[PDB]
């Protein structure tokens, strides 16, 4: 015979009697009591916990929880041998357990710019109770800002409710990177029972941002013949992402070889320095681009024009080019004349040249000996390096005191320290 | 005095004469010739290359390229000393050089799902010529499919044309991962000159795809008490991305500790195996989820329900519970009766139980001795393990041949190999 008893009733609640017919309890011992000569059976000071009983442990949904008990009728006119009877009390569930999350703080990581509608699962609540007394609903309590951004959805697919976050609008990590929601679970008892957990959405970073240089363009003066390791310039860029999506590498972009030889760009600090012989007379400007690149898996990159102006040093000593004109013409640094046609006639054309810049290539230019020849402007302009002078005569002269004219010229630039050159010519006669 | 001469003319082209006034060439030597008594000056079998001349090398845009030359008038009624004159021939540019890319194949990497409008720079073409004879336009020749996807844009920002790819629609790597375009550069000469390069767009992979399991759900039978390392089941998932965006890791998701003890999930292969004592009498089903996760920087993940049915083994030997009923009641495995009231009266209630399943818990149940007691059904149902029998009398008996009743019961299950138990009772008298 069967019986329906609510679980966890108070001691000595009567569960019933003889819809059949001394009575003894043979089995059911801790949880029940019977009375002699009545066969009315009541609960004990050990309450029946539907959730406690080994008898009811792994039972599948809606498989009824039955406690076995046996009682003996051992009187039939004190002649019969006793009659036991199989009993079954079906313990009925009450909402005496609260729905729960495994941890009271729950922590989702959602990437930046997840498309609208994207779903993410929330951990399930559980409830040791059965049927409508177990998990019933989920509710998403949220700050205003956050409410426009996040929704809740529940699936009846898996015959057990999987609650899910819907992303309702765009997330940007850079804008804001941490939200706070509470997820309320509730059961379907009366009264119901509920529980909460803090659901923290963490916005994860994507490499959605490129490097930018402090300045679009870069300029720097650099002194010619500087030593190996002299700081030319530091370029630096900026990335609004996080970690390696924002770590930066610097490398030459549109840089011809010459420059590559002379400069060293350091990838971490972005400090260009000298690594080679720098000569303004070779290359007066250094023009190149520089490439800033993040360490994202798909690297984003920027570039900046750099132009280095090479500053002059007086490292070039002037140059006295002596040469012929018209019919007069030199040979291994000496020429011919005799019984000169006139004074103020020209023996040589003389060009003085300096390869540096401004002052350091401004040339003064002087005839050494005691001879009868001067330099006279031939040019009709004032080009400060490119002097063209005639080497012309001062006094007439005859074949008797001649063939002994070593005219030597000297030149100095207005540099500091100054540099000088000397160059000569013999006139035979 | 000045002069305009086109570069790379044929030998002995006349560049002009005396808009002034023997004539000698003093400077300009390799590239020019003058004629005596005329002062008309013409080109040589060394052509003037505007692009060749050291004199014109690093010249900034539109800085004119001038070749210096000096000539001497050394006749003024054969009385004057000679007059030289500064010359300047301004060499004029002709479109004798073709616009070029550094490499003839160019190779851009664009990420999946780059937003429409996103720009990417193409390497610049160069042109050793000057002014309108240098780079003029860029043109993007393209296959139909590819044309809907990619545009060209040129910037006049940097005073030098930076050509750029515009992305015109969505790229999906999984769909198609390599395009072919040609980029045509052309100059602004007449006729113009042009050049091409193969521009290959490579679509780079983003982790835009989650794992999926072969099957939504997984089932497996597993024999109780199997050995450590026995293959239970292999779960496997699938990711349509590339590299580590598609490499997969398997780990238990909603798995209570018990299960964690008994099973070992291997992260690479996704093969669950035995790692602990499995007892159907402890846990008949193993229910858990499994988590597949890619090795993307922001891992995407799937999960699958797994349910393992534990199959029974005859590892439990039956259980003979002897106990009292009504007034008759046992004590350290023996009880009292004397001058029995009748035969077919019951001394004990006897329950035989096996903890296994089906056959291996089907019990036959037999009284050993030569005694006057049998087992008789007390229950009113056929529960195949839970037998309830009376141990009742066969023959009457008196106090003179008694107090020597060791009734022993034996039980065996229908398992293979079968298991047996024996249990006894003394009746004093
Ligand atoms: C570099 O980046 C910051 C943002 O991190 C920006 O506000 C700043 O103006 C940039 N440059 C300097 C000189 O701080
Ligand atoms: C796993 O992935 C492939 C695509 O790579 C899919 O077409 C296939 O059907 C999946 N499963 C099996 C059993 O091949
Ligand atoms: C070049 O030579 C002159 C002497 O002729 C010096 O004055 C000058 O400093 C340098 O030695
Ligand atoms: C239990 O004991 C019995 C003998 O009483 C055997 O038949 C059985 O196989 C097991 O040993
Ligand atoms: Ca309870
Ligand atoms: Ca309950
Ligand atoms: Ca509940
Ligand atoms: Ca962002
Ligand atoms: Ca970045
Ligand atoms: Ca970011
Ligand atoms: Ca130098
Ligand atoms: Ca210098
Ligand atoms: Ca100098
Ligand atoms: Ca040329
Ligand atoms: Ca040209
Ligand atoms: Ca050209
Ligand atoms: Ca894709
Ligand atoms: Ca993936
Ligand atoms: Ca992909
Ligand atoms: Ca077992
Ligand atoms: Ca078993
Ligand atoms: Ca058994």
Author numbering:
A (entry chain A), B (entry chain A): 3 to 23, 32 to 439
Recite the paper's sentences.
Protocadherin-1 (PCDH1) is a non-clustered δ1 protocadherin involved in respiratory diseases. PCDH1 has seven EC repeats (labeled EC1 to EC7 from N to C-terminus), a single pass transmembrane domain and a cytoplasmic domain with the three conserved motifs (CM1–CM3) typical of the δ1 subgroup. PCDH1 may bind bronchial epithelial cells and epithelial cells of the airway mucosa together by mediating homophilic adhesion and helping in forming the epithelial barrier. Here we use bead aggregation assays to show that repeats EC1 to EC4 form the minimal adhesive unit for human (Homo sapiens [hs]) PCDH1, despite its longer extracellular domain with seven EC repeats.
The third one, PCDH1 EC1-4mc at 3.15 Å, was obtained using protein produced by mammalian cells. The PCDH1 EC1-4mc structure had regions in which electron density could only be explained by the presence of glycosylation. Residues N89, N248, and N346 are predicted to be N-linked glycosylation sites and sugars can be observed at N248 in the PCDH1 EC1-4mc structure. C-linked glycosylation has been predicted for W186 but is not observed in our structure, while O-linked glycosylation has not been predicted but it is observed at S430. The observed O-linked glycosylated residue S430 is also near the PCDH1-I2 interface. However, sugars observed at N248 and S430 did not interfere with this interface in the crystal. We could not detect structural differences caused by glycosylation, and thus the role of these glycosylation sites in PCDH1 function remains unclear. An additional calcium ion near the EC2–EC3 linker is unique, it is at a crystal contact, and it might be present due to purification and crystallization conditions with high calcium. The PCDH1 EC1-4mc structure does not have this additional calcium ion.
